[PDB]
Amino acid sequence: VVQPINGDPFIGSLETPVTSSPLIAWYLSNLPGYRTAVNPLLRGVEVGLAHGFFLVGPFVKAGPLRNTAYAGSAGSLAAAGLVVILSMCLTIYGISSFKEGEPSIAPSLTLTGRKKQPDQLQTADGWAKFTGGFFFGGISGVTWAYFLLYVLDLPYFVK
Amino acid sequence: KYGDKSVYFDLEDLGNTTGQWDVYGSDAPSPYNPLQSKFFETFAAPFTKRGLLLKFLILGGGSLLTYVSANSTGDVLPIKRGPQEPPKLGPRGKL
Amino acid sequence: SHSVKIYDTCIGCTQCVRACPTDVLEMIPWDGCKAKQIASAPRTEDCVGCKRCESACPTDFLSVRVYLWHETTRSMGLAY
Amino acid sequence: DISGLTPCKDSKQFAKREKQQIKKLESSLKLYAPESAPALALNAQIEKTKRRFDNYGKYGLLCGSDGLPHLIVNGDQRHWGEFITPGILFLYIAGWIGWVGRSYLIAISGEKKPAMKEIIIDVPLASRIIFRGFIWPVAAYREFLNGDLIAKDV
Amino acid sequence: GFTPPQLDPNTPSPIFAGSTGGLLRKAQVEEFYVITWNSPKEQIFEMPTGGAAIMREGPNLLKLARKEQCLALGTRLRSKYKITYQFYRVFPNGEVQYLHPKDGVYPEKANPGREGVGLNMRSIGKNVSPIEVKFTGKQSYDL
Amino acid sequence: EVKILVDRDPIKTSFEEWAKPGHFSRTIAKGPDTTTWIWNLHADAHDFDSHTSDLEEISRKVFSAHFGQLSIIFLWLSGMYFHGARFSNYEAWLSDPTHIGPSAQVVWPIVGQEILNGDVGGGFRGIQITSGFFQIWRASGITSELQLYCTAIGALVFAALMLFAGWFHYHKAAPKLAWFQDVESMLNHHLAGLLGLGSLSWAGHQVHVSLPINQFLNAGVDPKEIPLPHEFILNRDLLAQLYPSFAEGATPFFTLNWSKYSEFLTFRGGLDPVTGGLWLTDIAHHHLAIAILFLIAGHMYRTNWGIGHGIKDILEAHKGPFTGQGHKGLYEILTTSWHAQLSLNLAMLGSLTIIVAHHMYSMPPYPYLATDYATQLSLFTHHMWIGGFLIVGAAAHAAIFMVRDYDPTNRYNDLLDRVLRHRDAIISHLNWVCIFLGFHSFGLYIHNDTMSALGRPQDMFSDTAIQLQPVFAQWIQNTHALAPGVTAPGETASTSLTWGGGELVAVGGKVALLPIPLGTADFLVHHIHAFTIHVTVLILLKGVLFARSSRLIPDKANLGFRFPCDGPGRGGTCQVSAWDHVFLGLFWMYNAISVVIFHFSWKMQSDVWGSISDQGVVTHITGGNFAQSSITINGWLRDFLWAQASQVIQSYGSSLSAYGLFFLGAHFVWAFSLMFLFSGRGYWQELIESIVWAHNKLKVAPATQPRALSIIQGRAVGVTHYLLGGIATTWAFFLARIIAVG
Amino acid sequence: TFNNLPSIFVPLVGLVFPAIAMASLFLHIQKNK
Ligand code: CLA
Ligand code: CLA
Ligand code: CLA
Numbered sequence A: 001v002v003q004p005i006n007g008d009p010f011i012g013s014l015e016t017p018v019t020s021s022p023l024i025a026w027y028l029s030n031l032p033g034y035r036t037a038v039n040p041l042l043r044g045v046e047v048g049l050a051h052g053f054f055l056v057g058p059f060v061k062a063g064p065l066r067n068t069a070y071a072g073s074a075g076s077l078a079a080a081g082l083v084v085i086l087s088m089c090l091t092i093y094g095i096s097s098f099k100e101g102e103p104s105i106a107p108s109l110t111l112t113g114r115k116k117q118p119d120q121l122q123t124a125d126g127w128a129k130f131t132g133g134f135f136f137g138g139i140s141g142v143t144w145a146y147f148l149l150y151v152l153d154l155p156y157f158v159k
Numbered sequence B: 001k002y003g004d005k006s007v008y009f010d011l012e013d014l015g016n017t018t019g020q021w022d023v024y025g026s027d028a029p030s031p032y033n034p035l036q037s038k039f040f041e042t043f044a045a046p047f048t049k050r051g052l053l054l055k056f057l058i059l060g061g062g063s064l065l066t067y068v069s070a071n072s073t074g075d076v077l078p079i080k081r082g083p084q085e086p087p088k089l090g091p092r093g094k095l
Numbered sequence C: 001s002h003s004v005k006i007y008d009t010c011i012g013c014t015q016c017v018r019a020c021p022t023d024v025l026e027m028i029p030w031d032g033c034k035a036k037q038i039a040s041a042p043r044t045e046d047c048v049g050c051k052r053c054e055s056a057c058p059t060d061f062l063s064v065r066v067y068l069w070h071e072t073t074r075s076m077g078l079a080y
Numbered sequence D: 001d002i003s004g005l006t007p008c009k010d011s012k013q014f015a016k017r018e019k020q021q022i023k024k025l026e027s028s029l030k031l032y033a034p035e036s037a038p039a040l041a042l043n044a045q046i047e048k049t050k051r052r053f054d055n056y057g058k059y060g061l062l063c064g065s066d067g068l069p070h071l072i073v074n075g076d077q078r079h080w081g082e083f084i085t086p087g088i089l090f091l092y093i094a095g096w097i098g099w100v101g102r103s104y105l106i107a108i109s110g111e112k113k114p115a116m117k118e119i120i121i122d123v124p125l126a127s128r129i130i131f132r133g134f135i136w137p138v139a140a141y142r143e144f145l146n147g148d149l150i151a152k153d154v
Numbered sequence E: 001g002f003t004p005p006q007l008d009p010n011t012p013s014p015i016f017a018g019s020t021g022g023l024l025r026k027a028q029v030e031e032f033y034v035i036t037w038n039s040p041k042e043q044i045f046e047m048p049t050g051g052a053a054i055m056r057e058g059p060n061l062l063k064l065a066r067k068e069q070c071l072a073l074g075t076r077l078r079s080k081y082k083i084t085y086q087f088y089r090v091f092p093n094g095e096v097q098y099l100h101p102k103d104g105v106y107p108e109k110a111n112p113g114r115e116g117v118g119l120n121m122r123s124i125g126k127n128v129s130p131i132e133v134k135f136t137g138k139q140s141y142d143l
Numbered sequence F: 001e002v003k004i005l006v007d008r009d010p011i012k013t014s015f016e017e018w019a020k021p022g023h024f025s026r027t028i029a030k031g032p033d034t035t036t037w038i039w040n041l042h043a044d045a046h047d048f049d050s051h052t053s054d055l056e057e058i059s060r061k062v063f064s065a066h067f068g069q070l071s072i073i074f075l076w077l078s079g080m081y082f083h084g085a086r087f088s089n090y091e092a093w094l095s096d097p098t099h100i101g102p103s104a105q106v107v108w109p110i111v112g113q114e115i116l117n118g119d120v121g122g123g124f125r126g127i128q129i130t131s132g133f134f135q136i137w138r139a140s141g142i143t144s145e146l147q148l149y150c151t152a153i154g155a156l157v158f159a160a161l162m163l164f165a166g167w168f169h170y171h172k173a174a175p176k177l178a179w180f181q182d183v184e185s186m187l188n189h190h191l192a193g194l195l196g197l198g199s200l201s202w203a204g205h206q207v208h209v210s211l212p213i214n215q216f217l218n219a220g221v222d223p224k225e226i227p228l229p230h231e232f233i234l235n236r237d238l239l240a241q242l243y244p245s246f247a248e249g250a251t252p253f254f255t256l257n258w259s260k261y262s263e264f265l266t267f268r269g270g271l272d273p274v275t276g277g278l279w280l281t282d283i284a285h286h287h288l289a290i291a292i293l294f295l296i297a298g299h300m301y302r303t304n305w306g307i308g309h310g311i312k313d314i315l316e317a318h319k320g321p322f323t324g325q326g327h328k329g330l331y332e333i334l335t336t337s338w339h340a341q342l343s344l345n346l347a348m349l350g351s352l353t354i355i356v357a358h359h360m361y362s363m364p365p366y367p368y369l370a371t372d373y374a375t376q377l378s379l380f381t382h383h384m385w386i387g388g389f390l391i392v393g394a395a396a397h398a399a400i401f402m403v404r405d406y407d408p409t410n411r412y413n414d415l416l417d418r419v420l421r422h423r424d425a426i427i428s429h430l431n432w433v434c435i436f437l438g439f440h441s442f443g444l445y446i447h448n449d450t451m452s453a454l455g456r457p458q459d460m461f462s463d464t465a466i467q468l469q470p471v472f473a474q475w476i477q478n479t480h481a482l483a484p485g486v487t488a489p490g491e492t493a494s495t496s497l498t499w500g501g502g503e504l505v506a507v508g509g510k511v512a513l514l515p516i517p518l519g520t521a522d523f524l525v526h527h528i529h530a531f532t533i534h535v536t537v538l539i540l541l542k543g544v545l546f547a548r549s550s551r552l553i554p555d556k557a558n559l560g561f562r563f564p565c566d567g568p569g570r571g572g573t574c575q576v577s578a579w580d581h582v583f584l585g586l587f588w589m590y591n592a593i594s595v596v597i598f599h600f601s602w603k604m605q606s607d608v609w610g611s612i613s614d615q616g617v618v619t620h621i622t623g624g625n626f627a628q629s630s631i632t633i634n635g636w637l638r639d640f641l642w643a644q645a646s647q648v649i650q651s652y653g654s655s656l657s658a659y660g661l662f663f664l665g666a667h668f669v670w671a672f673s674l675m676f677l678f679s680g681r682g683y684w685q686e687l688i689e690s691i692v693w694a695h696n697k698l699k700v701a702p703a704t705q706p707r708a709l710s711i712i713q714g715r716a717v718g719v720t721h722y723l724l725g726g727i728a729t730t731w732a733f734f735l736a737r738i739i740a741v742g
Numbered sequence G: 001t002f003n004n005l006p007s008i009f010v011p012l013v014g015l016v017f018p019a020i021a022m023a024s025l026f027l028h029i030q031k032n033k
């Protein structure tokens, strides 16, 4: 089912099973990157929580102090630092890409041709709310990963 | 008209022509619980001013970095432990 | 963008513009040669700078001449 | 005895180089019979080395502290065999090459398509010219005086 | 005021199974250079975005990426298939600028009705040195 | 259907066209206005697709050119067999092959180069060759120098025959296009008739000549005492005294009682422990089975009779669901284009050369090959390089197809179109995985280097600090070591002894391929190899796909396959041509194969090769310093490059002195190449015009106008000098290193 | 404290001054008036 995007052959993409399928499109459409209708703050919270855990993963066990007793604590600290930096670069991104009050640069159309509402994430205040959610969610996910490594160390692998 | 037989240049609907599509941007409503959403709103609205967020991030991160590197001892980083070893005399005496 | 210039040594052979892939050039009438035509460069905004025009100018050095200048999205030849 | 260099006919390290190379070639000589081709070739190389060292001794070459002949180029009459006589021997041949080539290019210059004579070398023409560079130091001097060596701009 | 633009209508596009060399976000915020041509038969041609397309019998329409794409296509059309072509420029606001002949005639036939610009009435060596135009916007070649 | 369509006297045998150079092309057959003309005379010399437009003359030209190549190879083999016959110690090398250096070249004593004739052994002064011809000849049961001279004369005869064949098949009776296009018969013959009957005839030699002779050579018999090979053909009692199955003749064969043939057609896999090579008994059975297989495979394609698969009927039968029409059209773009076939055959022949390199060290097929570490190393390295070059040429000729012979109107294909339509996806994911592999294969070396430099060896990716063990390769290794058994009975041992459960084949003092242990360093370097291969495929596939069009140049095909650029516009569009892509892929193939042969040399010298005393303690050439030093780049610089280049540079005044000479020289030629790759034509044309003023001042203005090299020519000169220099550096380094410590 | 000043200034300089500098310079790049 490799017919082009929206059946439009002169747009540079295709509706292959990987892009446009009932399972993978649904998955890419019901996650906080593409929830264009809900406010960007909850989206950013979800995103930051997930990436905070994903970053605390390869800092405790993989790192300069992984074998020491300071593995979990200092690794979570480095993960929170990387999260602060990611919110930092997200912030300069929101400042540089769109200024203060312009309308959303997101597409106001869908595959079915409906003149949907534009994604307010791409606005200034919207991206700022998204960055705030990302920072809050990321620090929270870092400390929760630290908590789970603390109180529930035995089921997880140490190696 | 964009939906005609192999017509992709609706000059009125330039979004469908140029490819402006939310390819996966579902406009479905908030699937979160309202109470936790309000909780996150009230607890992350401080991080709403991107400029204040950036100033806070840079200054607090630099402060925490200096604090960690100044209060950490040599047990967590060997550079502050010091030599804890006698110095070797270099070639030709020491020169 | 680029500054294409046609000097008065042109013989009006129409190779500069038949080689130009971006419609920058066009032949106009003139009274300075046996062919009674000379090339002009109105659409310099569409000039990418490929110098196919001056790789086909059969003169002492050149008559058409491309000067590299402020590069925009269309002079840089970007589809994005 | 100039430049702090002892001659090779009265040098110690030069004879030491000789002895060392001869012992090296003799160590590779006790692996074959003394009448077979390898041993005969090794003995020939040995005599070649010994005569080489003795010839460098008898020519008055100057061997330094490292024991190798250091050639003198300054212009000392004793050491014109180092640079100046072979230098003239070179320049005579090199100007032969240049002069026969130049007279060839001038010979084909009055052709309809001269470049095909640089690809397909006219061997009769060159062979009639190939010995005309024997006298290059005088023909070139006259072409310089007559004005035929250097071209004029027009 | 002798040749009017053509104002391409909603014509059909060639049969093509879709590629990746098509229209990216440049079209969504800048021009994208529609081309229109008129085929005698349903034949097959190489697309400038890579791949083979099947042009339709009658008028066609292709929105590819940029000027060089449509002009390369049109040159291949005119030389290989002997077919009249004309292409445009479609800004995202809506305007459609006509560009390829701008006189109904291709830019090789010196047809009167076009003003000569980019025209220095001198040999190319008689341009002034840069010091003669130092600290001036005119670089070397606009006097 | 198929026929012998061939036309007589198409072209006249005459020197008239020799006298007119550049006759083949229109712009070249009018004269050298410039010097570039001569570079275009050689560049387009074999570009027959550009000389003519019809495929008939091109097919005849390349057919006779292949005949010239075969004449050249027959003359080359004539030289090798002759030099073995006259200028060699092969008659002495058979006596003590584990200690006599195989030598087949002697130099002339003129200018001191007679030092190159060294103590190879055998009462002979020459150059220690690393070709393995001596090992073949021991595997062919030569046992003489007369046989080698006769082989050289016969090879010279076949060279002259092939030369006459090219002349006959171009000038006297040249085949027309219907003859080449009958690929069905060509495959039926080359499978069954060249590869089938060739392997069958070699099995006959292996059974009648190599096996009985090596049964004596390995059994302490001097070559002068061995009966001649034909005495086994004339007298079957002597042949039967070792293999009694010959007393029954072909009655075991035709009655299908093959169980009474295992004396000489074996399946006892592994290496002959008396000489280190594979069992010739197994190789005879091998080539026999391969003969059966290619003989049944060459009766697959319909030629004239009702049986056989028409290849069109095979390709058109395969039509994918969302893959479109599928393989329809390919028979018409492969049979109406030599460049497509050239690309396909080059790619497969190159990967096959590499597989040869890989299977010739781990299953040494010749006697006294594994112990001739120089031959083993040189052969692996050689065939690896040939394979990389053939793959890179496959890219070049795929690109040439896409520019010239590709026609979606007449000679249409569906799958090629589908590949062109998402070419950006292909190149994007390849450009990603190259970066991923680059990072996670070389940044690991950088991490190990930094951790070792910061005094943190507990943080490297080593076999001691952080385990990156090749678990999958270790599993395949351990199951191929324990393969003799339930999965592969009747083999008596593993098919190779490069696996952990294998054993050591002690041949003389040498070790000859004990197991190879795979550690973290092997993981790192194998991912480096995957990385370099993936980048080479990125560059080359990108050139092939974008040979016709890109977002930058949509009319690139009209510019040609081999063009420099399309001007400084578009920010600069240098090297958009597929020629320039393959010119870059050459460098990346060089980096790839260089690190490959470095991995080979070091892993072998550290974990495989060495010397095993009679007590059983094997000491390797380096000392097992691969898994500890090949985790960081400083080990390759220190323990491989710096250390193992202590026998090529210390070889001044030795027999290995030409190796150090070419070490420095290939260094030089590489660096000299950098003058071409870095510079541009315009500077050199301006300099040439200045010295042309200096010449015109003296009436020495050449009519063939001195022009700086064309841009594409500067790139060609740069890449060829770069490759030649790096490759000759590596060749000298390897050969001197491995001949000295041996 | 003099032995503790590198521990304050090196993490300050080599990480924050890149943060401040690269951020402010990316903002200066991506600007419009
Ligand atoms: C010796 C007798 C002879 C003569 C007089 C001719 C004469 C001719 N041949 Mg024929 N030909 C011959 C033998 C001969 N051929 C043989 C033996 C073959 C088989 C290889 C061919 C195959 C052949 C083909 C395929 C073609 C010709 C063509 C031609 C014509 C032009 C050839 C030319 O100018 O290039 C002269 C070229 C050379 C003198 C050198 C060529 C290279 C030789 C074959 C091998 C080089 C080996 C060398 C050692 C390798 C380099 C390494 C080195 C650096 C160490 C001309 C009518 C062409 C023609 O008519 O097309 C219009 C053409 O396409 N010939
Ligand atoms: C530049 C080209 C080149 C050169 C100079 C060499 C040089 C050498 N090769 Mg290599 N080789 C090359 C290309 C080259 N090879 C390529 C492209 C292949 C892939 C087919 C091979 C495969 C190969 C093998 C398998 C062997 C060599 C061997 C040798 C050495 C002995 C020469 C010989 O003829 O012995 C006699 C030749 C043989 C014993 C080879 C047997 C024939 C092979 C297996 C197949 C037959 C070819 C077939 C008809 C065509 C391909 C069919 C197609 C389906 C792929 C010598 C170092 C031999 C060696 O190292 O011995 C110590 C050896 O065993 N080479
Ligand atoms: C089966 C093997 C095979 C065959 C039949 C061909 C045949 C052809 N190739 Mg392909 N090619 C091959 C292998 C092959 N090549 C390989 C292995 C590579 C990788 C490098 C290439 C890369 C390649 C490119 C990139 C191009 C070709 C081109 C060509 C065509 C013209 C070549 C020509 O006229 O040069 C005649 C011969 C020469 C000019 C001499 C080359 C000089 C070499 C480099 C000398 C140095 C190498 C030497 C071993 C080192 C010793 C130095 C010593 C002398 C001092 C011709 C159709 C060209 C083409 O089609 O143009 C449109 C083209 O552009 N090929």
Ligand code: CLA
Pocket: F430, F431, F432, F434, F435, F436, F437, F438, F439, F442, F443, F444, F446, F535, F538, F539, F584, F585, F587, F588
């Ligand atoms: C050592 C020299 C060198 C290096 C490092 C590279 C690096 C690269 N080349 Mg180049 N290239 C080189 C020489 C080199 N090339 C030469 C001499 C040629 C001449 C032919 C080419 C031709 C060439 C082509 C034609 C192509 C490449 C490609 C690539 C990329 C593949 C690896 C990658 O991205 O993975 C990750 C990066 C590396 C492995 C590089 C080392 C970086 C280390 C691991 C970490 C760096 C530090 C880290 C980011 C911290 C930053 C600190 C901060 C202070 C800045 C990468 C950009 C290919 C490409 O772009 O597609 C992938 C490609 O198509 N190169």
Ligand SMILES: CC1=C(/C=C/C(C)=C/C=C/C(C)=C\C=C\C=C(C)\C=C\C=C(C)\C=C\C2=C(C)CCCC2(C)C)C(C)(C)CCC1
Pocket: D073, D074, D075, D083, D084, D094, D095, D096, D097, D098, D099, D102, D136, D140, D149, F698
């Ligand atoms: C003595 C000596 C020395 C020194 C010397 C000197 C210093 C010299 C100089 C010289 C000089 C200062 C010179 C100059 C010259 C100039 C010129 C100007 C010339 C010209 C020429 C010509 C022109 C020629 C030509 C020709 C010829 C004749 C040859 C061939 C041909 C031709 C044509 C090329 C020393 C001590 C070191 C050493 C010893 C020796």
Ligand SMILES: CC1=C(C/C=C(\C)CCC[C@H](C)CCC[C@H](C)CCCC(C)C)C(=O)c2ccccc2C1=O
Pocket: F675, F676, F677, F678, F679, F680, F681, F682, F684, F685, F707, F708, F709, F710, F711, F713, F714, F715
């Ligand atoms: C050096 C160089 C040149 C100039 C190289 C020249 C033209 C080669 C020098 C002349 C050759 C050696 C021919 C002269 C030899 C002839 C056969 C004449 C014979 C004379 C006697 C030696 C017999 C380029 O044109 C170039 C172009 C693009 C990128 C880089 C470069 C580049 O680096």
Ligand code: SF4
Pocket: C006, C009, C010, C011, C012, C013, C014, C015, C016, C017, C038, C039, C053, C056, C057, C058, C059, C063, C064
């Ligand atoms: S190519 Fe040069 S000479 Fe010819 S028409 Fe154009 S400007 Fe005139």
Ligand code: SF4
Pocket: C004, C016, C019, C020, C021, C022, C023, C024, C025, C046, C047, C048, C049, C050, C051, C052, C053, C054, C066, F569
């Ligand atoms: S540089 Fe290229 S685009 Fe510009 S006028 Fe010349 S040919 Fe046309």
Ligand code: SF4
Pocket: F564, F565, F566, F567, F568, F569, F572, F573, F574, F575, F680, F711
């Ligand atoms: S630098 Fe050379 S290759 Fe690049 S655009 Fe200019 S002329 Fe072409």
